[PDB]
Amino acid sequence: KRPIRLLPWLQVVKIGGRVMDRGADAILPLVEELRKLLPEHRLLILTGAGVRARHVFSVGLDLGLPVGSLAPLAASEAGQNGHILAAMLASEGVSYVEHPTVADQLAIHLSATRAVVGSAFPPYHHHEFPGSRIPPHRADTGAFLLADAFGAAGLTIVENVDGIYTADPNGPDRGQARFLPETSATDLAKSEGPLPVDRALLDVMATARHIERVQVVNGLVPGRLTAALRGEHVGTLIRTGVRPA
Amino acid sequence: KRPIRLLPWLQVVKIGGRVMDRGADAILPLVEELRKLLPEHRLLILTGAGVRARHVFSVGLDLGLPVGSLAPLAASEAGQNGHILAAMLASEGVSYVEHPTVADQLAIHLSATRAVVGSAFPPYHHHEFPGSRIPPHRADTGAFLLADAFGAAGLTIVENVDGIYTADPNGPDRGQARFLPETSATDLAKSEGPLPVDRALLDVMATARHIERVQVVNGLVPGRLTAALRGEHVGTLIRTGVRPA
Amino acid sequence: KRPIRLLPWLQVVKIGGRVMDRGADAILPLVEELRKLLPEHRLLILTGAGVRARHVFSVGLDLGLPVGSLAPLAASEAGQNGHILAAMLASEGVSYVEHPTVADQLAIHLSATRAVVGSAFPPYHHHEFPGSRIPPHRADTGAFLLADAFGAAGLTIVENVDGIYTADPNGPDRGQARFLPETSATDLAKSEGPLPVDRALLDVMATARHIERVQVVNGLVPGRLTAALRGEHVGTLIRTGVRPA
Amino acid sequence: KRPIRLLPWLQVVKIGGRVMDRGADAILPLVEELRKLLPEHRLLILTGAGVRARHVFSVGLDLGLPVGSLAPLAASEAGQNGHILAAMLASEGVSYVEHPTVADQLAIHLSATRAVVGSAFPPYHHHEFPGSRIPPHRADTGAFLLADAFGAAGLTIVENVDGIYTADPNGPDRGQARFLPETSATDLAKSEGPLPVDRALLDVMATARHIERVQVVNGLVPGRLTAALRGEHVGTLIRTGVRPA
Amino acid sequence: NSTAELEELLMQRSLTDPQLQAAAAAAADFRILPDATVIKIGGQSVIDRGRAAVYPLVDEIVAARKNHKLLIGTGAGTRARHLYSIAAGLGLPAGVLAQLGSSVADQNAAMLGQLLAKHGIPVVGGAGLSAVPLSLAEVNAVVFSGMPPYKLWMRPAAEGVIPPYRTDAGCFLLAEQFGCKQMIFVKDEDGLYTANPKTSKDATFIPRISVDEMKAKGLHDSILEFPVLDLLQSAQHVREVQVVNGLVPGNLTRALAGEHVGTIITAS
Amino acid sequence: NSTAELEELLMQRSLTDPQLQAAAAAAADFRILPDATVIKIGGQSVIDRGRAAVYPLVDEIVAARKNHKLLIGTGAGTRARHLYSIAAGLGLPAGVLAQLGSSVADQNAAMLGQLLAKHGIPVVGGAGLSAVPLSLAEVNAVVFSGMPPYKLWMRPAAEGVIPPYRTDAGCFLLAEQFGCKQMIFVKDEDGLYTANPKTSKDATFIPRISVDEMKAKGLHDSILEFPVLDLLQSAQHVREVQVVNGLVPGNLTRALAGEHVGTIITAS
């Protein structure tokens, strides 16, 4: 038997740090869409890190620091994005909550208000796994670990692209990049090349207990997040390999 | 004149650590009964410690540690029981809250949701009283101190036995153990022999300002907690010696 | 363009520490008036320090301590006044909240309950400005900084006098003290002599972005706070020099 | 002694029927302003009748019908305006409520949601007073009767003009029309000539028990309603002649 | 491979890009506490046994810190297994079990720390950064709780809800993160055997073995948490660990002096 | 002026009363850490430049703390400017920007602290009270984040939402609060010039100048946050500051030895 679902009515939304990096032009339409979603769902909104984590990686690696030092330095930027997003939603009752609050008191906070914002990075900190010089357990990974641990109704990953392509649609091989409407985590994990999601996300999907699909959608197109939260197919669906009880 | 009542509408429920020790067979029916009680009362649920505190006492005493070292080590187990219980109730909006939150922000948390869970041990810590090598201010004592300080409507102690007997109904003299439907704290304090409640509970009852009765009921019998919270006599009533204004 | 309003529906109320110093005779009618205001507004209630800060200043200065040491020692007394006030309102769902909670999670707490209480002193601490041996950024200043940063609907300062006079109405020149129904911050800042509000309040008013007026009213006269929160002129109005967009 | 206040925390807002007559160009900015006011106040929004009542008066008078027949025919148009306004606010939890609901169950409905909408016309119906062939107890009158009976915190009348002038600012003598920032009901009642408010409003003001002032503001200027509800002077203030207890 | 080449990739490519990962692998490598030793004191194997096991180890730690900087991590033990059994029977997930287990390792750190307080040695937070206790000859040692901080974000095992990363992994990753020179697991057996010696009569002692040889013999989940073996093969700084019997007086002291007591498990 | 005279006024008059303020000004003046030096390491000017700038400064700090007690504060840098730009474009107020900027200064303190941990030097809280790290010859230094704690209660500037009190002010007020003997700002230019030398070809070096002379020359907001100049004129303990180039090897060491490298800015 699988573990019970702790918050089966919860919807988790991960906002890519690079969406926030675009500033008001991206954030204002997203805030407006989130505002209209508040009466429809019970939302845990988790922010990624984006470009500032890249800069602190550049300084940190130049200083020679190990992966367990770089992990909390990148998490910091996800937290700042979360404070920024929550501030824009304060007038609707939304605040940023800390990791201990998310892990132990999420139920009471979602009883008080319709949504909260937190950092998507998991608290692996100085106990990050070695191997890569880049912390593997990042924002997509932390959001999925939480969503699946809670037994949430879904996790939706909100990106600055339409979904997963066969190559980086903003990179050198952009010309041969083909859109992938649906994929499986095991298929992706066997591929080589870049992805819009952490590779570690594919690993924790393999051991997941509840979440069957995760959809990656373009948060720069208004309405896609709303449609995804109703299960409409508007980006890339990732099948996790959990299949029903 | 006596002090005012801070939360006169509050009901405090203490769950014995040994009830939790029985695992799912005991906890699942209790969780279901608590769930149906949520719309009826405003509940502060406090968990005791149980058998794991006995083990840490065995190690601690073997190491020679004083009573002020053993007190927070036992409190830890009450807190873990509280996290376990709250997790089972998360989908109904219930979370575990810390001692500082219970002492300073209980009002706002019970405005947000119908019940919270906390540790019944009081924060006496390294300032526990000397005398016994066993910490005297344990879960029953901490729950009563809080309930009476708040001026709560009641405190109900939920045990793995029907109430107070003339001897341990699970011990050597079990054969001569007679059930006590009602008793007074002063009568109990003059008796010698074991009890299902801390002896320190009898002492703080003597200085109490508001709570007149505390009922000890069998949480292994579904419906007894529900009846006790409506004032029905289904276990042992302890008269504290507070009598009305 | 000016910054957005974070909590435009919020009303901030600052309770003078010297009002609390009068004990039950002042606090009980104030608590009753606050209770009837709870269903009408969304209140952030901030307490000042009062006479105990004067005593710790006397000891601290005698010990030679600098202004950055005296600032958190005075803030402590504002916090204690806040715990006292909140305790009197606990049965209505009101609790004291800490500065980090006010700064990052006020939205969710005012979603859970109708009012919260906090310390009016700002967290300048050991980084208080030098110059005076008396900390300049005190309770009036901290309350206004918060209210204006939030873009709140108003800030009302609740005193033990009717408002601002031309001299201390409790001091040596009391005989020539004339009541000032309305004034501007810039006019006050050019005056010399004592005031019922921090001089630093006048400075932050000069850089304010949203709050146009702050009314000082006598909290010892029941109904004045209620009238002030509806914009009725019952004390001294201070014009900040923000004028509309 | 005066009667108690039934809903002292209530704010009553009357929307002129002629504001609604302007359609989306007027209604959409008003709906947006009302939406941002919802978290700040507890609102009873009452709609007037406007031009359609003029048409039914023309038909009714041509048919010779008495004033007690014309009164419910005009009230109908106020009710339709109320359904229109409420529909625009439905997604925020606002609905139209009937007169019996306003008179007997307003407390529970304002416990469920932040605002409700009703018809401002009073239910005088076929028992309207004789004298004029035009029903005297219209929308302004009905809104004030309710607001004062409830002991509400205020009544704000939202018009298609800045306030009360010395002549109709849209009529023949428009050239000599001077704005009146403040006035008394008794002064207005002694004047002859048209007004933006029912003459009967002046009469019920004379017997009022609680409401001291009513402000008439231009709902076609965004922000004036918001300012008026905080007691800022942005239109014409009418003093009723109630003065305090 | 230049700083400009790495910084361009860090800005222009996803962190998942193999080209970025490879440039990052070429970065310089700083050891934060290269001269410290991380020691794990087993919860079940040592601390749960009480005075007869703990007191001799306290004496060794006190004597050893005169010549050695020590980060001393605690295991959890039977109270954690009790909590795991309760929570597992309720259907609670591994992330909830991980939080429960941490409290037990915290208890053990507090009990150890109180026996060492009169020698100046504290129980700490950010031990690998607790630079001030480690830099003094009068101190030269810290005690910490050995559980990793993952808590609700614990990755579950392939089967079951028992957190796969517990106090062996927590202590090992701290040693690895801070670039410590040595990692010693203090348990209740002389070291690794061909089979569990508590159950087998004729198990054979293994003085030295690599991770791959251990997997080839079915010893992947034997005296160490099996994920520690995989963590060890990916490690940058701690490429071998040593397992010794803390119930034998002087074993810890002799391991710190370079004696080949117990079993040495190498990454390769 | 007696203690009784001051205590009467403290009880009977508003803190705004000029008579009370004057009696308070006559109180004795205690210096909490009179023998320490506060050093600010610039975020943009030093730490963002990486190994080539930071590693030589680490070496100097390690050598210098043998003869000098040091409180080492970090600036923030380009990541804070990125956050300020995002937040400003959203209309967020200065109080929200101040919180965001603090996280970046915290990052820099952690990176510096990890390079110094093996020398015993910690990253701290209440550095000016962190009496135990400062009192040891083996340590004698702490690292702290340089942002003031005002956060949402930050007073805004006259124009715009950029917090006016940032890491120059945070470090300076700490030096002033604790009565330290010296305040050194470590940047990336030799000191103050007649104009920004990064933009001007013929700017002239200024070895020594008062706050008023700087204002008279339009240098009010040049190499230091302009509020620091006003803070300096109101200071009780730190009546002058020194600005030196941290990219020049030994500059910090020589400033600590009393050499007049860089620019000395005096209150009067």
Ligand SMILES: Nc1ncnc2c1ncn2[C@@H]1O[C@H](COP(=O)(O)OP(=O)(O)OP(=O)(O)O)[C@@H](O)[C@H]1O
């Ligand atoms: N196969 C791929 N399909 C789609 N996008 C890709 C692929 N490979 C690389 N990318 C790139 O990944 C980018 C998203 O970058 P990234 O995932 O690092 O940002 P983010 O998720 O917003 O950041 P964070 O992980 O901090 O939340 C896209 O803009 C795209 O350029």
Ligand SMILES: Nc1ncnc2c1ncn2[C@@H]1O[C@H](COP(=O)(O)OP(=O)(O)OP(=O)(O)O)[C@@H](O)[C@H]1O
């Ligand atoms: N006179 C008595 N009457 C009833 N029970 C008794 C008596 N004396 C001893 N007991 C024993 O007390 C047991 C309850 O144990 P205990 O009170 O320690 O557990 P608990 O209250 O669940 O633990 P905690 O105090 O940690 O919450 C009963 O099962 C019974 O065996």
Ligand SMILES: Nc1ncnc2c1ncn2[C@@H]1O[C@H](COP(=O)(O)OP(=O)(O)OP(=O)(O)O)[C@@H](O)[C@H]1O
């Ligand atoms: N010009 C003035 N007008 C009115 N009151 C004055 C004036 N000058 C001095 N005061 C004095 O200020 C007193 C209020 O004191 P103060 O403002 O210190 O108390 P408080 O605001 O309650 O304290 P806190 O700032 O700790 O909240 C009044 O009682 C009055 O005696």
Ligand SMILES: Nc1ncnc2c1ncn2[C@@H]1O[C@H](COP(=O)(O)OP(=O)(O)OP(=O)(O)O)[C@@H](O)[C@H]1O
């Ligand atoms: N003295 C006056 N001052 C201001 N407006 C006046 C005056 N006399 C007449 N008016 C007219 O009254 C008009 C408002 O008309 P009226 O009050 O009938 O509409 P309403 O209040 O929207 O309708 P209802 O009573 O159905 O709600 C203004 O547009 C203005 O032309």
Ligand SMILES: Nc1ncnc2c1ncn2[C@@H]1O[C@H](COP(=O)(O)OP(=O)(O)OP(=O)(O)O)[C@@H](O)[C@H]1O
């Ligand atoms: N092949 C083997 N060789 C040696 N010991 C083995 C082997 N297989 C299993 N074991 C068992 O592993 C035990 C050590 O692991 P254990 O988890 O008990 O130590 P621990 O560090 O105390 O754990 P914790 O700290 O989690 O309580 C030994 O007591 C031994 O019985």
Ligand SMILES: Nc1ncnc2c1ncn2[C@@H]1O[C@H](COP(=O)(O)OP(=O)(O)OP(=O)(O)O)[C@@H](O)[C@H]1O
């Ligand atoms: N007149 C001047 N003389 C010298 N430098 C000047 C002058 N005017 C402007 N500057 C600039 O000020 C810079 C130092 O300020 P800056 O804020 O960059 O230092 P910092 O301490 O690194 O800041 P932070 O810590 O906030 O990143 C120098 O690089 C220089 O270009």
Ligand code: MOO
């Ligand atoms: O512990 Mo809290 O203060 O639930 O939202």
Ligand code: MOO
């Ligand atoms: O301080 Mo809280 O975050 O009331 O539930």
Ligand code: MOO
């Ligand atoms: O963080 Mo909370 O919002 O009231 O515990």
Ligand code: MOO
């Ligand atoms: O009678 Mo009702 O159906 O209160 O809103």
Ligand SMILES: [Mg+2]
């Ligand atoms: Mg991504």
Ligand SMILES: [Mg+2]
């Ligand atoms: Mg018991």
Ligand SMILES: [Mg+2]
């Ligand atoms: Mg005052």
Ligand SMILES: [Mg+2]
């Ligand atoms: Mg009208």
Ligand SMILES: [Mo]
């Ligand atoms: Mo917090």
Ligand SMILES: [Mo]
């Ligand atoms: Mo927290």
